[PDB]
Amino acid sequence: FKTIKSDEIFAAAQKLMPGGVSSPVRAFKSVGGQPIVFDRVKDAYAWDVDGNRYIDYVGTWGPAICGHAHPEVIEALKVAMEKGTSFGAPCALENVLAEMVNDAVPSIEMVRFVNSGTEACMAVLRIMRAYTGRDKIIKFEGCYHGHADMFLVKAGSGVATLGLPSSPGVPKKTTANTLTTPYNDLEAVKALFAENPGEIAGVILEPIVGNSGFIVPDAGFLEGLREITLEHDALLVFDEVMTGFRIAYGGVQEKFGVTPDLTTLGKIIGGGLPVGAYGGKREIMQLVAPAGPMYQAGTLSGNPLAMTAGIKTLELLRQPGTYEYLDQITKRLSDGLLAIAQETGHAACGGQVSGMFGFFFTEGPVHNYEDAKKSDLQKFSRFHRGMLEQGIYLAPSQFEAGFTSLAHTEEDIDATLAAARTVMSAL
């Protein structure tokens, strides 16, 4: 196993871009700092600039649910780019995706497309405060909603209400209205409300966590957050940028039967192109300009290429047995990893829902970020590297959920398990 070309390109990148990457995690600092430079991806695989081929469990972080470079998506894109990559004006494709999004996810009756999860979340945050007239927001430790200043706050016991910025360059002023609570902790949220009567605009969260490893909501958690927000006329916002169209066609809200007031979407709805969307109830979305006073603009938003890829991707997801397959192969993968971790003597816990999964090197179970933080990062680092050496590309971080696609075959899963066995036996 060698990554000479990646080493070279990455080395040169360090002089051109901060850390040699467009996004922090890509720097592999959580797992050796030796990132892989991709050349191309197809179906369930990715190819190195060195020729290395991997079974991919990142799927460009969600979008590639139907597999990398799906022929139907690229075909639809070929037609779209022919008509121009961007209009800066209304196009019929926006209506189409909008309708699909509306018909697909319960809480969405109207949507505004944007260009990233970060844009979606910062806008949805602004809308929650605009609709309620309240400034305080409740987020959960371990959840990620982009890098808007409000979200860049320190979390954990002792600073849950301190609103301390967790990054230089962000005024305490801006984080002063962001409250955090442990995921899967209803009493923690009730507490935040009581401590701030009439000030909580709402609660935002990943209905199923992927940014602190894979973490599923304990029974009654989503129901509880729904009850508590309704009781205080506060808004419940599901960040389904990652879970949207992956956990289920209707996202976690559809699968678990809990309807929020607003939800953010992304990844899949763009077919690989930068995209994002924030929608929800009609009465709330009407505040978004130019229909309402809450300002939010996106010059290249509703991009025809992004809309086309999103539409084609959803049409594919609409086909029969789609999510049943993702669930099947993924459960197989997940149970396999845990069985292998057990047989090799490694403390581990994990799970999966549809085509999304997690695997922590700790006994767990993992109900929140604090639990996740107990995972053996050194072990994970060696694990990730080993899997890489075995031709398996996993998210370069213990705190990132993995992804499967309709392209992953029964054989891919088994080759992966074989590799996992080989790697864990050597850990």
Added chain:
Amino acid sequence: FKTIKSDEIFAAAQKLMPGGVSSPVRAFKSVGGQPIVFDRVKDAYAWDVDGNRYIDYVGTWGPAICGHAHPEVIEALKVAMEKGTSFGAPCALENVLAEMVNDAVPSIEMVRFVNSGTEACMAVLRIMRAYTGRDKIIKFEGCYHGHADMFLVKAGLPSSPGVPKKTTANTLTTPYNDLEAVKALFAENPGEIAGVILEPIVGNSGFIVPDAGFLEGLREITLEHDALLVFDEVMTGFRIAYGGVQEKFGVTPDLTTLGKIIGGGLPVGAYGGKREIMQLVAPAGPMYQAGTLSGNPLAMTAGIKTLELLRQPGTYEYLDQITKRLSDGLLAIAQETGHAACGGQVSGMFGFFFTEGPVHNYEDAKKSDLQKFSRFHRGMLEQGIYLAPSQFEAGFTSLAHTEEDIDATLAAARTVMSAL
């Protein structure tokens, strides 16, 4: 002039998306409220869903500088997507674009690609504060830097709902082209000013050129108070000149944001400057900023190809040539038809206000006769000309715009203004 299909699609859109659009301006609220739905765009044209063709002066707001759907860009795109629409990991194409950007603009030694001007600006604002360790920012009224909260300031009070005053408190604003005001701000906030951000040439409150010495003065005082100078060239970058306004006017900022053109139509953005400052950005430094789909291979591809095209000889001279003729023509026609107007142009960027002006700032811009602009806009639309649906938006030309297109556009203007 029929726009039946546009109306139908738009009406249905208003039930699916706020205002029936993905971005406020597209709703045509300032010019009648009946936007035209595009089906496709080619070269210097836009084609309606009703079969109408328009000589396009919006160029999807900047990206289409080499023309809409340029064959080489679409070909480069079709070839690149075959390898994947996105990696979510490093690819050589990022190094290439980064290098072309670094070589192109005076102040950039290191760059971080993002997905929009908004992300670029909020990120640059954060780096400004992280580098200086200060929170107060100076922005100009009439300048637009995305919808990030700190920018949604009134003129540090919120200008729209949903944004806590607490976050806009650290945002100081001043009239564009007003050095004394900026100076006063620094004095009223000693040791608290992280820096100054602005569009070196304004396009978001109409086309507004900086006065002689303005940019030079801003560089001087920021240096004096150990504060950063940030050029938001998302709109001007690679348009005013290959190196943007900073190159053309010769004033070098410490940091600059980019977008539009660098993505050839695809969602894109970037911020860069001296490596000493840029090294603060994660994962190199402690300042956090991330973008899951940033450095998109398709966006890099289209940006790389778009820049290669711009690097050809006569590119900016051509833009300047046809645009000056367009701008001069408009003002001449306005004069001969008896309408107070003022405008100007620099490269393929221009403005035309229905006000005698002068227009050195937003306040001046607001003196324009919006009613007249609206009727002008509609009439031009009927004459087969598509201008920005706002008096407060600069216009754009592209390499695809022919001498004939300009002739036709001026002829149209004559007809419209003669009817105003």
